[PDB]
Amino acid sequence: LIGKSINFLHQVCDLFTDLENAFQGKIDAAYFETSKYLLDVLNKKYSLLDHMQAMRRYLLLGQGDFIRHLMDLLKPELVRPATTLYQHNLTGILETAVRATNAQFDSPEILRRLDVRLLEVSPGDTGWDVFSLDYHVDGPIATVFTRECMSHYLRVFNFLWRAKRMEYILTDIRKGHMCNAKLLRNMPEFSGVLHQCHILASEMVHFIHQMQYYITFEVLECSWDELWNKVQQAQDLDHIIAAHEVFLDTIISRCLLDSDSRALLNQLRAVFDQIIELQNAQDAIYRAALEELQRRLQFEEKKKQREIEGQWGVTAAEEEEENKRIGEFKESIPKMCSQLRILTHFYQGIVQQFLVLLTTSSDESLRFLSFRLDFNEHYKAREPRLRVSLGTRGRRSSHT
Amino acid sequence: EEKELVAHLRSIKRYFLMDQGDFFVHFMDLAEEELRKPVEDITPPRLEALLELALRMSTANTDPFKDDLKIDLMPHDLITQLLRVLAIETKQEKAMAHADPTELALSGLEAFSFDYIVKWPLSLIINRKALTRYQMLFRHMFYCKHVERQLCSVWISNKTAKQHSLHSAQWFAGAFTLRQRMLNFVQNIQYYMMFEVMEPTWHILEKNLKSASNIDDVLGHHTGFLDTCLKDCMLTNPELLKVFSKLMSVCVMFTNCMQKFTQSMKLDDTVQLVSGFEATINKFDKNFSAHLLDLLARLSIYSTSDCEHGMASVISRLDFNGFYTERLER
Amino acid sequence: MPREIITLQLGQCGNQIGFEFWKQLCAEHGISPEGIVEEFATEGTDRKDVFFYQADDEHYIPRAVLLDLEPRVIHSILNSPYAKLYNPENIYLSEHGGGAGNNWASGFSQGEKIHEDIFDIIDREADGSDSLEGFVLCHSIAGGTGSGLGSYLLERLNDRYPKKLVQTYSVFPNQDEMSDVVVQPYNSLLTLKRLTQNADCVVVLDNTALNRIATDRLHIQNPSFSQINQLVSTIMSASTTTLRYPGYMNNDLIGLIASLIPTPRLHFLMTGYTPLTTDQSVASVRKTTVLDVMRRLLQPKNVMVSTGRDRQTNHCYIAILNIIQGEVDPTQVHKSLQRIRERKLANFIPWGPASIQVALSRKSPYLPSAHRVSGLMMANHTSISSLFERTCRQYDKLRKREAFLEQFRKEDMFKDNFDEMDTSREIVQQLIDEYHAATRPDYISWGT
Amino acid sequence: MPREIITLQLGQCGNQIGFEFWKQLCAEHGISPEGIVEEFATEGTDRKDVFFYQADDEHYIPRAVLLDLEPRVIHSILNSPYAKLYNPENIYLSEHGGGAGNNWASGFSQGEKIHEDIFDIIDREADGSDSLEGFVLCHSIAGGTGSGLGSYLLERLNDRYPKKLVQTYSVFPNQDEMSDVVVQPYNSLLTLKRLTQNADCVVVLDNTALNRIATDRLHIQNPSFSQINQLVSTIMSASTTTLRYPGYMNNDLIGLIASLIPTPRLHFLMTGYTPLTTDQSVASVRKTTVLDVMRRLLQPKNVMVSTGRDRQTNHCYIAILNIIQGEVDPTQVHKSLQRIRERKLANFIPWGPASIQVALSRKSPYLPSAHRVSGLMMANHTSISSLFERTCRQYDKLRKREAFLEQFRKEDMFKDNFDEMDTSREIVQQLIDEYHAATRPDYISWGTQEQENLYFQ
């Protein structure tokens, strides 16, 4: 262990009577001293604790304002086909969101390590599929933040970013619906379409935001804090490496980024995709409802203005066209409501199945995602697994 | 010093011996609805959360070892378990082995025990044999408290029934007197178990643990403590335990009947319903009195033939006013 | 959760007794007069929620409702150290400040006028209580306001928490002393009526008995009215101890009174305490023995109920529970039982199961005990009927004479007649008869 | 980009409440009263940009527009330590200083007179925001000026930002104190109307519950209006903490209100907080038990919201957003919401997935919390309509009696008729119907005139 620690520092940072025991204690003490010196050298030269803090802030979503701002900025971009995304443009958007959010207050050494990564852009891909945070690890810190650890951290970052992007898309849809309700108050027949869009978007936002919360806090933030605490408490360079690897593996598993949680990750990804589909459908419904409301308001305003000018408020042809437009809007409102309800029901089914898989997942963060997705027990009413998982195991260990 | 045997033992007293009455009150308040379900219908999450509420809610939160306190749901009710154990090498062994396990879904109230996590090297002293004895004591006190709570609920329900109908007050007098005999009985049994068995055996343990010369002396004193509490709580006599079990079952059935009648009267042939209720109360009173006289008779028998001087204390507590004395003579 | 007790404070005397009771309960639970947990109350084994309710996440407020028909007592409560103990919404003061004029009926009518405030107080205390057992009304039966308002509070406590048990500590007026409050016998009857109808167990606190205990046991030659109120508060504490000090058994008020109250009518309880000491008499730590404790608790001179020495009737306890704390020798307990039997110092009910329950608990570090070993007895004893029967007879004697009825006729409840006083006297007579029956095997048929 | 919130300060009382809200947000974000980040505020983990805008790289200026018909409050703000937080061009004070005379219609006319300044402030704050979420209107429902000006600000924010969310902190009047403003019900009705129609989420803070808590816990016989208003501002702050303190979830105003506002019309939210403690009672470290906490939360004396008993609507939760302040684990928040569901404290829509969203955020190190653990719930529950329906009915009762109307007849909005009051009553009725619809699977069609006509028959 001593020679290994020395090599890490270099490359990364009674004898007459009982000969066997005379040097054993001395060998162990020298090993401990050399290993401690190696770990201190690795920390001082490679900023291992600083790299871990950067990973926590960016890849573990610890800088929650930064992740929020990134997702909000990406929402209008990430809905577009990824083939039109420029990695330079995505990095610029990330930097702009940082400057517009509390991420601007991060240290330049931390902020320089938080970046936007664009995956290989394919047609039809959304930004949620290609956006990730990354944390560059090198030198001695790369012994603790190994390529596997960095990949797991980036996986958790991307998963949280995708979930937050879908949540924010659905939140923008619902915000548009709610705001346009004020405009559509003069078009009450169109208000229901906006309300249905708001409901579907709210369900999708709830699902995506709960998945992101679980991943970023229960998995990512906790595992990052454990890594940082272990590194600060590390007695040797190998102990620091092992503790950081274990932390990263825990983050991957609980954020569903490990190899074993791949089925849970697929179910969560399908839930996020159904939430994004619901968000897009709700945004389209709300856009149509707001356009109809604006047309009705413009027609009413023109009628009032012509009446004030002493002209016949609407021509019989213009009045027939206005009545036809209002009729078409009202007939589309029940249709829009039905489409939004269908999208909401599909999203809710996908979310319920994801929550069931998460509650059956070994990862505790996935159980927290299931509990959050069914806070009002909607998914618990739809997914039996979220109800069963907490009740069944605790009674069995109580019988001994 | 390093394994804090006395601190762990004080934690065990706090939880397993129901020394923290406020803790048990809070726990039973939070958990009563969940524990009343069949063990299969109980959500273990709710029991763990009620335990945590009771831990955070009691003065045990100042106990550094409170996290070693666990909820344990026993696979068998305490009475069947003790009768099977006592039947070993007895003529009853075959009867218990051939006794079909009654299809009565074991309630959490009957399955509830504590467990206590002892780490090495302290796991040498607070072993599973000790923890199981602590679980037996806990479950016994919890069941006594359940019977007390039921008798008080029947009391409250009857006080409410007395408020809604002035005319029904005459019919309620007999149910009140039955409840009062059950309540005085339950409280005196709980008092014996808590202050003459569990408390004395714990004080003996702490004194003996203070006099221990080695870890084996501490283990010996703890085993002797547990065995003394087990002996003095009447847990080692299968006939007394079986009579006490029947008495508590009759008490619970009486309290459930009184609660149902009071709820019906509050929500509200009625003369027929009242005569049926009074007949049920008189049948419960007869059964309770018969089981109580059999208990007092058995305590007197063991006191005279087996020199179990402790059994005379049970009798004197049970018949402190001589209510059973004429009945015992009869 | 603890079995919370709502305190109803009625009139000047009742409000003083309630304030002193809440002070004593706070001291036993280590609650400051301001509602702050005292640093000395480190023994978290006490049920503070029994005597205090949480008003907010940080402030513990005594569950006390101050009700008076005269503003002097309510203002004195709001000017007392317990001003922060009571919920300000739980303090009802009559705007007219005129009191009940020493008229029980006027006090009852004022209680009816303050019914809304009192039941709001009871509901607020119940909602702040996780497992509210019920309300305990502390009042004097000798005045006009405290007796009638106490009965009103008891009625409203039964109405507001109708499914919860309500035990009361009702101080009955002395019937052998000529009360300067000519309507006191009516007031005493009304208080015994309310205890009979709305309480499940009533511990009768005779101010004559309080004075006797102060003289013979506390060595107080002239017990002050404040000392009588403190004795009544001590009696209420002793009767509520099983609710306030949780143990293996009798952890709730309904559970505590269940063992004590065989029939709803036989709810007249007598109390005894030993050793009894006045606050001033703390100096001499009397080495009280178990025999001395049991004898004084069974002695009428130290008992907080003034029963006459009936030589013809074997008055008896329906049930007695003695909770003894401290160093107790089994041989001393045995000698105590022997001496009690030889002297027949206690008669027990013959008609039902009764025992002394014993729960072992640590003492409060915040409450100074004047005795190296102390014990409280709560008992249902037929000798309380002698207080209730005498109160009923005095009530009938006053009502038949219309004595002090002019003060009651000012209030609507007594404007046309004094029928409420006669009904109170009849209820107190029935309560006395039922309590006397509880000493006899025929108590099973009592009230038939 | 962060979701900026524009603060609209209406009338004397509303402007004072808004100023204190902005002060509290600054304290939580470590912003000095002058708008400068303190040198000690090195923990850049707080989201100041949610409630404040940056004027330069160093100076954070509140997105606050101060509109009053009486100059006293605006001058007091400009004479307060927070004078430099607000844009001085965003402070409108009526030269006449006479206020609205406790007339809701006068307040609306004053808002119309200060429309340009307030909407210019809102637009300036939005343009400085890369991804402005919306405007938050701060006003009082009891006065005259703040209610009308608040309704005007909400209307103009809805008109200008039709794709942006509008969250409101709507203070309901104290019902236990006799208001000197006899026309308060008209003001309250207009404010509830504007929150229902033009806001996307309204957190109702009922001063009546604050007064009840002051009475029962502080032993205060007569709780003043000021303490109730400060409690209401605290409740709004707690409900907005998840928007103001970014975390893993609900880190933006649109994200915060999305989880709380299930339908665009059913946007009337009720709030609850536990454990509630008064700032003064820090002295007594109360051994509150978990059982005592849950019982007290259910006790009306400890709940910071006085919801009316609606007898007509089987109220249910439409959507719930939980803003948790302090050290919060997302799994613990989730378990808490689960336990709330087990107790059926909120009924959710049956036609789609709905839950209480849980965001885990770090607490501000600079703000001392009087409570070891605190939590805010924001929920849309139809029983909140019972307060708004009662306010509307009282407004109609006053208008039919012309009570205190002489102050309103001075303003153009009420000179010829009281149509603004009837429109406010109609908006509150539509809000009630939508909240009732939001309890039903037909919530997809909530706010459609067919459902308003089916719930009013």
Author numbering:
A (entry chain N): 241 to 253, 277 to 663
B (entry chain M): 533 to 800, 838 to 899
C (entry chain m): 1 to 448
D (entry chain n): 1 to 457
Lines from the paper:
The complex is an asymmetric cone with 14 “spokes,” each comprising a γ-tubulin molecule supported by a GCP2/3/4/5/6 subunit. We found that the C-terminus of NEDD1 forms a tetrameric α-helical assembly that contacts the lumen of the γ-TuRC cone and orients its microtubule-binding domain away from the complex.
Using a similar processing pipeline as for rec-γ-TuRC, we increased the CDK5RAP2-bound rec-γ-TuRC reconstruction resolution from 11 to 5.1 Å. Focused 3D classification yielded a clearer NEDD1 pinwheel density map at 6.9-Å resolution. Prior work showed that CDK5RAP2 induces CDK5RAP2:MZT2:GCP2-NHD (CMG) module formation only at rec-γ-TuRC position 13. Our reconstructions confirmed this CMG module persists in the presence of the NEDD1 pinwheel density. We built a molecular model of rec-γ-TuRC decorated by both CDK5RAP2 and NEDD1, showing that the NEDD1 pinwheel retains its structure without disrupting CMG module formation. Notably, both models adopt the open γ-TuRC conformation, based on γ-tubulin:γ-tubulin distances and GRIP2 domain rotation angles, relative to the “closed” rec-γ-TuRC conformation derived from microtubule end-capped reconstructions. Thus, CDK5RAP2 and NEDD1 can simultaneously bind to the γ-TuRC, and NEDD1 is not predicted to significantly affect γ-TuRC conformational changes during ring closure. The pinwheel also allows CMG module formation on the γ-TuRC—at least at position 13, explaining how NEDD1 and CDK5RAP2, key γ-TuRC attachment factors, coordinate γ-TuRC localization and activation at microtubule-organizing centers.
